[PDB]
Amino acid sequence: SSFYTVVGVFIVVSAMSVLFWIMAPKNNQAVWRSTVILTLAMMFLMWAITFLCQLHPLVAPRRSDLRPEF
Amino acid sequence: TGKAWCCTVLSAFGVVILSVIAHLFNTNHESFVGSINDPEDGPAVAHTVYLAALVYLVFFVFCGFQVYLA
Amino acid sequence: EKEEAIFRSAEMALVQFYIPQEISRDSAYTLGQLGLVQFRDLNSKVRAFQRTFVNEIRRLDNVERQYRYFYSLLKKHDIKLYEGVPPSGSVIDDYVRNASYLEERLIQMEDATDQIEVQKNDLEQYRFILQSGDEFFLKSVNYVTGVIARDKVATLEQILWRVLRGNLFFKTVEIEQPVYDVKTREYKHKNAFIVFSHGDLIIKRIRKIAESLDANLYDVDSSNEGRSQQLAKVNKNLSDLYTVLKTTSTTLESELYAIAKELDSWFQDVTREKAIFEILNKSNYDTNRKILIAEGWIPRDELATLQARLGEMIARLGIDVPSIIQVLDTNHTPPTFHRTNKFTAGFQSICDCYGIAQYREINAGLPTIVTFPFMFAIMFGDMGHGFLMTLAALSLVLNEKKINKMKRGEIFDMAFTGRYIILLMGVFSMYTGFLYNDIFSKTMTIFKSGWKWPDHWKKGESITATSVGTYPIGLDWAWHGTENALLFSNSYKMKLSILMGFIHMTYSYFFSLANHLYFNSMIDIIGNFIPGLLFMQGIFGYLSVCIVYKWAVDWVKDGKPAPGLLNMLINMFLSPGTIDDELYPHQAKVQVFLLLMALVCIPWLLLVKPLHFKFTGDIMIHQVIHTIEFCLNCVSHTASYLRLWALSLAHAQLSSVLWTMTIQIAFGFRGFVGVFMTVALFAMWFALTCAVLVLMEGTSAMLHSLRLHWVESMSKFFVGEGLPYEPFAFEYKDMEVAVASA
Amino acid sequence: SFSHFLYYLVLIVVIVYGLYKLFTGHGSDINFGKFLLRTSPYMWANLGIALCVGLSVVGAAWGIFITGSSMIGAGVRAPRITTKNLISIIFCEVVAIYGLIIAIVFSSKLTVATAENMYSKSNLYTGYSLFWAGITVGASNLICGIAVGITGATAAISDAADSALFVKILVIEIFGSILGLLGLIVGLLMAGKASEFQ
Amino acid sequence: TELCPVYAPFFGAIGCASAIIFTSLGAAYGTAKSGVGICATCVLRPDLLFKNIVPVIMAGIIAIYGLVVSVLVCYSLGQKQALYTGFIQLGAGLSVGLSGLAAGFAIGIVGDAGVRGSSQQPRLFVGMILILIFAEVLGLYGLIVALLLNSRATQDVV
Amino acid sequence: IGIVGDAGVRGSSQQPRLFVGMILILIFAEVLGLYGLIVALLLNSRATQDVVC
């Protein structure tokens, strides 16, 4: 859609990160917080990169082997 | 011996992967019959891959029975 | 409360133990079961009577050596051990005496049965020669026959050929079973040989030659069946010798069975006694008041447990132990202790391989838990291989308790220890393969494509798609099979590598910030952190935001030319103030400001700290070296993160070549030939996938992720040089490991 | 040997060909000037850049394996030497840094010239300049890397023998590194007035 | 034409070949030398086997860099490309290939020496890893120059 | 032929039975020149066959 899709997904992921930081289990709390929040950060970052590279692409797919029926 | 277990693992993976491949060929999936170089047969390739998956199923059953027996 | 101690190392306190002499063993045992005290070696300096308990250590080491000898005998006879309050002190003496007595008896028995075995082997070889065919003995004394080691049969034949000047009738026959030799203590394969010659002189020369090669020569009666009487004699001798050997071996195995049911308990008790006496040897023995001064490092939150357990031990031992614990402040470096669990142990271990964390600095293992598997996943981005390795890791972790208390080895042990590492690598590899839209070189078609192919085209026509949207998650599957798929994906993955590396480096450098705040080194914040942060951001964070912004801007729609970011970055330094293609308004001013900021930050780092020292030495040269290293690293590490894209490209190309070869070829055939070809080519494809993609590329991706954490990440914050926390604790020492470490 | 046989054969062929061209009145047919004029400036510029970075890396890696093999051998008995003998590895690296920097600066000049201005005075100058400055930087860096690696090997050996002997050989290493720096400076001066292709 | 002669793709194709070939030769030298060192070391110290594999993997990354550049300059190839473009691809291939050749040779020599030394002195493993990292960033530098040239390959070519 | 004949006469002086083996290996070395001769003869037979000026 646009960069605002990335911004909205970031808002959702940040809300989840804050609520998990608040609601992290007491046992291994630092482990839970670091693992989950950093996992969310890396997953979202790589999704956002993949989404942005395709948002306004400068190169379009080109091929000479696609059958016309498909 | 470990030969039976290795063949069991390979044959279970064969059943799963070749069943998925045969289904994708039968449904004329883009990633498998889309290209000109890809087989024109479609469901005819699906039948062959189904037969191969059945062969791997026979191997899987035989080796799984053998490893439990041994 | 109980400190988690995974973000930073646990807090340590140095404690003095004022152990009375009469309860020293009891105190050492109690501290051993507690397992939370790492004892300083107060007798570390070399001097006379340095260790008070050398004799006890010698006794227990001798007993351990005797137990290792017993276990070697037990393994020799394929006998299994029975693996299913301190000892009285007299119990240790009983162990020492019993070990000496049983060692004497077992050496005597082993020597007797070894003589019986060697004579039996001689007679068995002589019987085997006598059991050869008549043609073996067909081309006074007419020949020399014997048994020689397999490694020397060729040497013997060559020598006999040369001494006899040709004219050699030499036969050798393999002996099926290897025969033990006492000289080398090796189970050497042997050959029965025969050589034919007439003269007495050449017979004795051949005999001397063979015996020089340690060949057991034998006297066969004749070349005819008259040797049957010797064969019968040897059979009688072997029968009597078998009776004697059984008589000896049954008693020897009875004694071995008797000691095997309790050898493990003996080894555990003796190892614990040697450990406690090692600890007591670290304690100053103040003879005036008969106390042992023991200095130990203990976690501060475990100090209450220390005091409670020692108080209970004292309460059991009368009331004659006052004030056994005294915490004393010191300038010694506390050990670095991180409280790991089954999940975090592997990541902490891989971080600690580079170095042990400094006391109380931020632990790298906690970020590593995510960053290492996810960097691996970026370089291993295939859902198929990610799923395979996830399955391996799930088999490891679901059978975790079964595989615990199981003999693993080395490869299995490595896989088990890093089972959660492999689990997260596999899960993240499935996620990153989904983002790459790659499964066994194929693509998913989960969502509607953002690309619409032309309405109509002819067979073999070049068609270019039209952007009708954006793929929700992952690379759009329209790129699969296109002739410019790698053109788009290389830009994507190169920029992705740069961006993820920039984020990782920034996170690590902010860890350096938090270290500076924790150690209250504001001078480091002002003169080491801030200039470096501004340099690294204003150059490479600016590059990263430029990448993202150029992604966000629609250049074709706006009619503006999409700027080359590499050219932009290079001209930012070579040609300040000039913009070839304008990424954003006021680009020249922002870029020159960033360049001046980055240039200023180098004198900043190189001077603000040493000038703070001098104006408020070796700090100057240290800071100059640090600034040179940091400035080189800020560029070299960003460059090094291109290995993410490099390995992802190599992994994808290897998957494609393994699929297009082998398995894809099978899809073009039909009939029984087609079915067999599909089966064989799937077997081949799976084998090469496991051996090349999971094994070669997987190991490469693990190593390069480890490199990026040790070099690119931990160089930002990790000081290292910390002392590992190794508390004095009791454990079940394995007899296999003990003998293997002899 | 065989290689020397090819050298002699090539020299003989060159002399026979040159004499044949000279005697037949066609000595000017071997036109090195026309070859330089009609050859693409892009070939010279790209060969200069590629040889610059590649030879600089060759020297850096060369000296790295020299110094590193000596450091690891000398560290079996003196593992202490490693930490401060990494300075030799850094001195060999700085050579490839020079080559990389020159490659970047020179590739900044690799613009597309117009068809009618391909072989202009400025474009031919830029091709020759980038070619020769790339060879200068790359060869000076290869030489400097080999020399610095040799000196770092001797420094590792001397450090293992005695701790006090390392600093003098380190000064010799600095003198070796000056050579790669001078190659950098001369390469920058040779391409200093070379315009980008226009 | 003048700007796009028929032989212009030769430099691009031979640059692609050079990028893969010289990096593969460097990686093969590194793999062979380090692997002989590993086999020699692990006869008596098999416990250091998988710890000693590091030079072989850092040799493989050299060939991976060459593969990256070969993929790039292959996708930039064309029948009617400019001589500018062909020499850009030749320069990229030559730069990465020669850098990877040098880096792989250094990795082989240093990794051989260092697996042997770490067999004798475990403290030498870290030093050997550090020297190998220094040797690997050289192939990285060749890759970086190749990336710059390849990025510039598409500029204003007509 | 030179290498094999050298080895086989140096070994046949010690082992008379090696003579026939050396003969066999020498025949295998000789058929190489024979194959070259056959190729040359076929070429020469085609040298002037269907040839014009």
Contact between C290 and C8 under an 8 Å Cβ cutoff? The reply is no
CA distance C478 to C488: 12
Number of inter-chain CB pairs under 8 A, B vs C: 58
Q: Which residues between 153 and 172 in chain D have a beta carbon less than 8 angstroms from any beta carbon of chain E?
A: none
Contacts of residue D89 in chain E, CB cutoff 8 Å? Answer: 130-131, 134
Burial-class residue F48 by CB neighbours within 10 Å (0-12, 13-18, 19+): exposed
Closest Cβ–Cβ partner in A42, A50, A66 for C463 = A66
* Other CB atoms within 10 A of residue C84 CB: 6
DSSP C8: B
**Gap from B68 CA to chain C (nearest CA, Å):** 18
Whole-angstrom distance, CA of residue C545 vs CA of residue C449: 27
Query: Beta partners for C16?
Result: C295, C326
Rg (CA), chain B: 15
Contact C574 D108 (CB under 8 A): yes
Contact at CB, C682 and B38, closer than 8 angstroms? no
CA distance C151 to B53: 50
Chain E within 8 Å of D195 (Cβ-Cβ)? Answer: no
* Amino acid at the residue C303: L
CA C394 to chain centroid, in Å, comes to 20
Q: Which of C464, C488, C500 sits opposite A46 (nearest CB)?
A: C500
| Coil, helix or strand at residue E113 | helix
Pairs of residues, one from chain C and one from chain E, whose beta carbons lie less than 8 Å apart: 72
Cβ neighbour number for residue C410 with a 10 Å cutoff? 11
Q: What's the half-sphere exposure (Cβ side, CA atoms, 13 Å) at D117?
A: 11
CATH code, domain with D160: 1.20.120.610
Q: Is C1 exposed, middle or buried (0-12, 13-18, 19+ CB in 10 A)?
A: exposed
Q: Using the beta-carbon criterion (under 8 Å), do B37 and A67 form an inter-chain contact?
A: no
Residues 6+ positions from C721 with CB-CB distance below 8 Å: C355, C356, C358
Confirm whether D143 is domain-assigned.
yes
Owning domain of residue D123: 6-191
Angle at C352 (CA atoms; ends C347, C356), nearest 5 degrees: 140
Give the count of domains, chain D. 1
What are residue D80's phi and psi, to 5 degrees?
Answer: -65, -25
Both tokens of residue C130?
């006598």
Any idea what DSSP says for residue C226?
A: G
Query: Which residues have a Cβ under 8 Å from the Cβ of C174 and sit 6 or more positions away?
Result: C150, C189, C191
Residues on chain E touching D134 (C-beta within 8 angstroms): none
Contact C95, C113 (CB under 8 A): no
Residue A66's DSSP bridge partners are B35
Q: Give how far the C-alpha of residue C694 lies from the chain's centroid of Cα atoms, to the nearest Å.
A: 18
E142 and D93 within 8 Å at the Cβ level: the answer is: no
Provide the domain count of chain B.
1
Strand partners, C17: C294, C325
**Which residues are paired to C285 by β-bridges?**
C292
- Contact yes or no for E141/E106 (Cβ under 8 A): no
Interchain CB distance below 8 Å, C699 and E53? yes
Report strand pairing: C466-467 vs C451-452: antiparallel
Residues of E within 8 A of C636 (CB-CB) are 137, 140
Crossing angle of helices D81-107 and E124-152, in 10° steps, is: 0
The helix-helix angle for E8-44 and E124-152 (nearest 10°) equals 170
List the helix and strand counts (H, then E) for chain E: 5, 0
* CA atoms within a 13 Å half-sphere pointing along the CA-CB vector of C354: 25
Test C477 with B30 for CB contact under 8 angstroms. yes
Distant-in-sequence, close-in-space partners of C370: CB < 8 Å, separation ≥ 6: A34, A35, A38, A39, A42, C424
User: Would you call E137 and C636 a contact, using CB atoms and an 8 Å cutoff?
Assistant: yes
In D, minimum Cα distance to C625 occurs at D87
* Residue C390 burial (10 A CB sphere; 0-12, 13-18, 19+): buried
- Rounded Cα distance between C269 and E32, Å, is 49
Looking at the complex, report in whole angstroms how far the Cα of residue B69 sits from the nearest Cα belonging to chain C.
21
| Domain interval for residue E137 | 1-158
Mutual orientation of helices E124-152 and C618-640 as an angle, nearest 10°?
Answer: 50
Q: Which domain holds residue B54?
A: 1-70
Alpha helix positions (H), C330-482: 345-354, 365-379, 383-398, 400-403, 411-417, 419-436
> Do D65 and D75 contact (CB within 8 A), yes or no?
no
Spatial CA neighbour of D81 closest among D148, D156, D165: D156
Q: In whole angstroms, what is the distance from residue C444 CA to residue C436 CA?
A: 10
Helix (H, G, I), strand (E, B) or coil at A60: coil
C477 in B contact zone (CB under 8 Å): yes
Contact E148 D104 (CB under 8 A): yes
- The label of the residue with tokens 């990440």 reads C713
**Residue whose tokens read 């993609």:** C693
- Choose from C568, C632, C711 for mutation: most chain D CBs within 10 A: C632
C-alpha to C-alpha distance for B47 and B53, rounded to whole angstroms? 10
Residue E109's SS3 state is helix
d(C-alpha C548, C-alpha A53), whole Å: 8
Q: How many domains does chain E have?
A: 1
Q: What is the H or E stretch that residue C538 is in? A: none
| Residue E105, CA distances (Å) to E97, E98, E102, E135 in order | 12, 11, 5, 9
For residue C571, give how far its alpha carbon lies from the nearest alpha carbon of chain D (Å): 8
In one-letter notation, the amino acid at residue E43 is: V
Q: Could you tell me which of E31, E24, E137 has the C-alpha nearest to residue E70?
A: E24
Beta pairing, strands C38-39 & C325-327? unpaired
Contact with chain B for residue C458, Cβ under 8 A: no
Residue D32 lies in a domain: yes
Of E1, E145, E155, the CB nearest to D103: E145
What tokens were used for F48?
A: 């002037």
The three-class DSSP label of residue E53 is coil
Touching status, chains D and A (3+ beta-carbon pairs under 8 Å): no
What is the spatial distance between Cα C324 and Cα C18, in angstroms, rounded to a whole number? 5
DSSP state of C525: I
Return the residue of C nearest to B38 by Cα.
Answer: C668
How many angstroms separate the CA atoms of D146 and D150, rounded? 6
CA angle D179, D182, D188 (to 5 degrees): 145
Residue C4 to residue A31, Cβ atoms within 8 A: yes
Q: What is the DSSP letter of E46?
A: G
Across C703-731, b (16+ Cβ under 10 Å) vs e yields bbbbbbbbbbbbbbbbeeebbebebbebe
Residues 562-591 of C with CB under 8 A from D: 567, 570-571, 574-575
Q: Is E28 an 8 Å CB contact of chain C?
A: no
Exposure on the CB side of residue C416, measured as CA atoms within 13 A: 15
**For D60, which of E2, E138, E148 is closest by C-beta distance?**
E138
Neighbouring residues of D113: CB distance < 8 A, sequence distance ≥ 6: D41, D120, D123, D197, D198, E84
CB contact under 8 A, B36 and C674: no
CB A17 within 8 A of CB A37: yes
CA distance C118 to C179: 9
Domain annotation covers residue D46: yes
CB contacts of A56 in chain C (<8 Å) are: 551-557
**Min CA distance, E138 vs chain D (Å)?**
6
Q: Which residues of D touch C (CB under 8 A)?
A: 97, 104-105, 107-108
As a residue count, chain A comes to 70
Nearest alpha-carbon partner for C683 in F16, D144, A40, B12: B12
DSSP reduced 3-state for C568: helix
**How many whole angstroms from its chain centre is CA C275?**
26
Looking at residue C700, its amino acid is: S
**Separation in Å, CA D179 to CA C545, D34, D67, D68, D85:** 39, 35, 18, 21, 20
Distance from CA of D41 to the nearest CA of E (A): 9
The Cβ of residue C594 has, within 10 Å, a number of other Cβ atoms equal to: 19
Cα separation, C514 vs C719, whole angstroms: 13
- CB D105 to CB C632 under 8 A? no
C707, C371 contact by CB (below 8 A): no
Contact call for residues B18 and B45 (beta carbons, < 8 A): no
Best probe of the B interface among C679, C685, C688, by most B CBs < 10 A, is C679
CB contact set of C210 (below 8 Å; sequence gap of 6+)? C144, C146, C148, C156, C193, C195, C217
Distance, CA of B23 to CA of B26 (rounded, Å): 5
d(CA C597, CA B7): 63
Q: What is the 3-state secondary structure (H, E, C) of D128-184?
A: HHHHHHHHHHHHHHHHHHHHHHHHHHHHHHHHHHCHHHHHHHHHHHHHHHHHHHHHH
Nearest to C71 by CA among C245, C247, C270, C267: C267
Q: Are C689 and C386 in contact (CB under 8 A)?
A: no
State the Cα torsion C241-C247-C249-C252 to the nearest 10°.
-140
CB atoms within 10 A of CB C68: 16
Resolution (A): 2.6
CA separation, residue F25 to residues C634, F2, F20 (Å): 68, 11, 9
CB C256 within 8 A of CB C271: no
Token representation of residue C74: 């037990």
Helix axes C698-707, E54-75, angle to 10 degrees: 100
Do A61 and C344 make contact, defined as CB atoms within 8 angstroms?
no
Subunits in contact with chain A (3 or more CB pairs closer than 8 Å): B, C
- Interface subset of A 49-68, CB within 8 angstroms of B: 65-67
Q: Could you count the other beta carbons within 10 Å of the beta carbon of residue D89?
A: 26
Q: Do A61 and C435 touch (CB under 8 A)?
A: no
Question: Where is C287: in which H helix or E strand?
Answer: none
**Would you give the distance in Å from CA C707 to the centre of its chain?**
15
Find the closest chain A residue to C345 by CA distance.
A31
Buried residues in B27-49 as b, exposed as e (16+ CB within 10 A) = eebbbbbbbeebbebbeebbbbb
User: By C-alpha distance, which of C334, C323, C335 is closest to C17?
Assistant: C323
Chains E/F: 3 or more C-beta pairs closer than 8 A? no
- CA B50 to CA B27: how far, in whole Å? 13
Of residues E50, E57, E67, nearest to C649 (C-beta): E67
Cα C646 from Cα C420, distance rounded (Å): 26
- Supply angle C-alpha C655, C661, C663, rounded to 5: 85
Of all helices (H) and strands (E), which one includes residue C686? Answer: helix C671-688
Residues 6+ apart with CB under 8 A from E34: E55, E56, E59, E107, E108, E111, E112, E115
State the DSSP string of C590-609: HHHHHHHHHHHHHHHHHHHH
Determine, yes or no, domain membership for D196: no
Q: What's the CA gap between B43 and C500, in Å, rounded?
A: 43
